[PDB]
Amino acid sequence: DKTFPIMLNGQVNGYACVVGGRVFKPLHVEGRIDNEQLAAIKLKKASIYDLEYGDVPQCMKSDTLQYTSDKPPGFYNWHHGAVQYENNRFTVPRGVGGKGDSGRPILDNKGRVVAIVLGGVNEGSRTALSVVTWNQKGVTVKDTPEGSEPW
Amino acid sequence: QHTESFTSAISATAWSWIKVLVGGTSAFIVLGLIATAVVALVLFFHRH
């Protein structure tokens, strides 16, 4: 797995992570990408999408496995423990999921990155997030609960 | 020398033909593009 922080002013401001099929960088924030191999790659950002085009030589291509439909409620391994929910983002503990750690992938226990967080700072006594994943049939759609800011 | 109007009413059949052609072509292309814009947009509006 290659999940890389983004270098801004010599400190971490983002967190770039490569995914199956295409290499991914969260283009919501800026900062020089730490990896030198990615340091010479053109940027392809859409109006609302903040994703890097996949231009890694196909030796290390598809570092991960993408995620299909049929979301279970079960455990998804997160950087800070497992997450367990199905209707929307898991009720992450308070304090966790704040700010400054943009671009963190949530993966299945089977190695299938279910979604990519793009904010969702607080959602009450619990907290869900604003993320993007396949819609129902494999459509890269973002869902943003109200009160969502990059985390 | 004698009573005539000359009120820009000399646009001939070919003249009117060409003018309506060019106006219609411009209108058609711009309206088609406008339609295509929202055609693209509604897909994304449906993706969620």
Question: A5 vs A9, A13, A112, CA distance in Å?
Answer: 12, 7, 21
Active site residue A28: yes
Nearest residue to A147 via CA among A116, A124, A117 = A124
End-to-end distance of chain A based on CA atoms, in angstroms?
A: 21
Experimental structure resolution, Å: 4.2
Encode B31-44 in three state secondary structure: HHHHHHHHHHHHHH
Phi-psi region of B44 (alpha: psi -120 to 50; beta: other; left: phi over 0): alpha
Question: Which residues of chain B lie closer than 8 angstroms to A141, CB-CB?
Answer: 47-48
Nearest residue to A133 via CA among A111, A106, A151 = A106
Closest-CA residue of A relative to B41 is A47
**SS3 call for A40:** helix
Question: Which residues of chain A lie closer than 8 angstroms to B48, CB-CB?
Answer: 135, 141-143
Question: Which residues of chain B lie closer than 8 angstroms to A145, CB-CB?
Answer: none
d(CA A45, CA A50): 5
- Residues belonging to chain B with any Cβ–Cβ distance to chain A shorter than 8 Å: 47-48
Closest-CA residue of A relative to B44 is A141
Query: Which residue among the candidates A101, A102, A108, A148 is catalytic per the annotation?
Result: A102
